[PDB]
Ligand binder design. Structure first.
Ligand SMILES: [Zn+2]
Ligand SMILES: [Zn+2]
Ligand SMILES: [Zn+2]
Ligand SMILES: [Zn+2]
Ligand SMILES: [Zn+2]
Ligand SMILES: [Zn+2]
Ligand SMILES: [Zn+2]
Ligand SMILES: [Zn+2]
Lengths: 156, 156
């Protein structure tokens, strides 16, 4: 069906967020693996699967709405140079992405695009879990200090 | 070992090219699948595996050289609105990426970073194959006209 123009615009924006997140995951996972940080690597990998699914859903919805994927400028990634900077950068991305997603959800709801709204609601639930994980690891880094946090990742 | 600063810079640039290409593949493959274009979908998917491997190699080399992945601004993708525009956009990316890669190969060679040079030489061989495919499909589109080309993709 021909979708709402502004919904399709939101979906394109959100798809670009997902792609940026995937890009940043691709680098982080490998950095963590190189440092021996198995648990951080594994969480990054699992969350990347989620983000790919999100991106899949966006493209399918855009195409079903007779729109075409068309990305905004995705910008410069802030990769980070140490584990705290990396996770803090992820948190920044994830908080902005959740803000965008709430805006889109409200808008889709307001114009009776309930299928788009419901899709986005599911994605947001996943993103809130990503945020919770990040915030929790960053709180540990503050409590323990980064070096002590890194040393606690080392497996018996 | 501590690598050459400018080599690491090149590797970062080339990694960003790979990420852009992967992003564009993620969209194109799904567009093609939605249009029923099985053979184009399949080639895009196979080439995306190559690009991911390339990106893997770059990150590993940067890390082995004691550098850190650090991406340039990757910009706005030109997705295209029809199959010719999509493949032409891919060709543009791939030609620029090959130009960058020859520059880096020459530089790495010149400063005796032969391991980096040899890695890039392998990647370039793959990229030249991507270029050949694109150019060949685009020549068919010119010869046949886009619509007749699209109709010839439809399976008996
Ligand atoms: Zn990360
Ligand atoms: Zn996501
Ligand atoms: Zn997320
Ligand atoms: Zn701190
Ligand atoms: Zn393509
Ligand atoms: Zn490549
Ligand atoms: Zn390529
Ligand atoms: Zn033409």
């Amino acid at each position: 069906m021909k979708g709402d123009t502004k919904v399709i615009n939101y979906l394109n924006k959100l798809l670009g967020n997902e792609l940026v997140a995937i890009n940043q995951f691709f680098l982080h996972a490998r950095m963590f693996k190189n440092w021996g940080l198995k648990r951080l690597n594994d969480v990054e990998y699992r969350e990347s699967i989620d983000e790919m699914k999100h991106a899949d859903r966006y493209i399918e919805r855009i195409l079903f709405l007779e729109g075409l994927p068309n990305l905004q400028d995705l910008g410069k990634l802030n990769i980070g140079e140490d584990v705290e900077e990396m996770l803090r950068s992820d948190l920044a991305l994830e908080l902005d992405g959740a803000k965008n997603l709430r805006e889109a959800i409200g808008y889709a709801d307001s114009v009776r695009d309930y299928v788009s709204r419901d899709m986005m609601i599911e994605i947001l639930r996943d993103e809130e879990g990503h945020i919770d994980w990040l915030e929790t690891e960053l709180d540990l880094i503050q409590k323990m200090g980064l070096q002590n946090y890194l040393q606690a990742q080392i497996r018996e």
